[PDB]
């Protein structure tokens, strides 16, 4: 019985420009088993209308999923990804860093 | 085009 915790990346589809429409991505990978809960947050509040890709897995059998939502970045709005999984004693938040 | 279904494990 394998139990592997998800790697989490938070990033935009295109280079983020304030005021221009974009997509916010939360990529979870390398986890097992496949049950996982992923929420996108704006200023700590859960974003409704988040879509996700179809469950696939890697050559090492670990699963990956992309969660995404359209957004328009601003200089002060804060965005994050909240992930829960059986390996996580408490939910994990990864903040979007424009990098 | 997916493979046809074979025998159970």
């Amino acid at each position: 019985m394998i139990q592997r915790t998800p790697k989490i990346q938070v990033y935009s589809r295109h280079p983020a420009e304030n005021g221009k429409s974009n997509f916010l991505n939360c990529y979870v990978s390398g986890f097992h088993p496949s049950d996982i809960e992923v929420d996108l947050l704006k200023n700590g509040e859960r974003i409704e209308k988040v879509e996700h890709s179809d469950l696939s897995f890697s050559k090492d059998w670990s699963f990956y999923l992309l969660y995404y939502t359209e957004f328009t970045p601003t200089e002060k709005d804060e965005y994050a990804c909240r992930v829960n999984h059986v390996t996580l004693s408490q939910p994990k938040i990864v903040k979007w860093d424009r990098d | 085009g997916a493979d046809g279904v074979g025998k159970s494990a």
């Binding site: 019985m1 088993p33 179809d54 469950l55 | 085009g1 997916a2 493979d3 279904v5 159970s8």
Partner: protein, 273 residues
């Protein structure tokens, strides 16, 4: 090279109904089909434009393959729980990946068909597509089972025949997007950490296919040790992203170059901050 690849996942949930079955198919790094037994209307669904225009009988045929496969995988999950004598209250996962590869030739190069149970290798067709390799004694039951019914003969027939015929058809119908390479869009960023240390990051965005090599070099020789790579990630639009970071002594940035190699680049790229 070009490839067609399928990924099956089946997950038991005792007391919550029958196991869920999910299937996805790809040509190279482009998904073109999905099936989910838990979907609102469970049927084969297109994920790429070059299978959208396939007719309703094609889709009806694929949907019935998946429903039949879903039933067979629920049986395998129950059999596997018996082989290992596991409690009937636990959830378990059965995964399968299979596919075929075309060489630079455009002719068949290799095929494969592999299984995992609860995230661990279970049984696999060998590279010759004629014999099996079982991971433990429970998988030997399946091997004895499958070789008694010449399962490998059936799978080789698909992988070396039908699978290549579909792949060629897909490559032709979707040639505008499948047989083009989009080069990475690159740039280098710099972040000072301390009086003695800085970090260089080399970005690659919007490239297809996913395979790419980002290498940092000092004085022209590759420095794989100090570099830090992210996992290549999907942009969500069909292209991919990746970056490589290296920690450099502050002030020595100009001795470092990032080497970018991609199918979409006519010659490799040398980047300097």
């Amino acid at each position: 090279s070009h490839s067609m690849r399928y990924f099956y996942t089946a997950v038991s949930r005792p007391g919550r109904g029958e196991p869920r079955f999910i299937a996805v198919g790809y040509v190279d790094d482009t998904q073109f089909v999905q099936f989910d037994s838990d979907a609102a209307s469970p049927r084969g669904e297109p994920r790429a434009p070059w299978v959208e225009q396939e007719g309703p009988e094609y889709w009806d045929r694929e949907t019935q393959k998946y429903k039949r496969q879903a039933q067979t995988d629920r049986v395998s999950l129950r059999n596997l729980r018996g082989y290992y004598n596991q409690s009937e209250a636990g959830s378990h996962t059965l995964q399968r990946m299979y596919g075929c590869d075309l060489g630079p030739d455009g002719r068949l190069l290799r095929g494969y068909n592999q299984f995992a149970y609860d995230g661990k290798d279970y049984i696999a067709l060998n590279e010759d597509l004629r014999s099996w390799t079982a991971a433990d004694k429970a998988a030997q039951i399946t091997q004895r089972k499958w070789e008694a019914a010449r399962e490998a003969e059936q799978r080789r027939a698909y992988l070396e025949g039908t699978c290549v015929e579909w792949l060629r058809r897909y490559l032709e119908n979707g040639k505008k997007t499948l047989q083009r390479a989009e080069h990475p869009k690159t740039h280098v960023t710099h972040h000072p950490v301390s009086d003695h240390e800085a970090t260089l990051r080399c970005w690659a965005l919007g490239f297809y296919p996913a395979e790419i090599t980002l290498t940092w070099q000092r004085d022209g020789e590759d420095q794989t040790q100090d570099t830090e790579l992210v996992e290549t990630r999907p942009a969500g639009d069909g292209t991919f992203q990746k970056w490589a970071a290296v920690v450099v002594p502050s002030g020595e940035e100009q001795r470092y170059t990032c080497h970018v190699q991609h199918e979409g680049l006519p010659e490799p790229l040398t980047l300097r901050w």
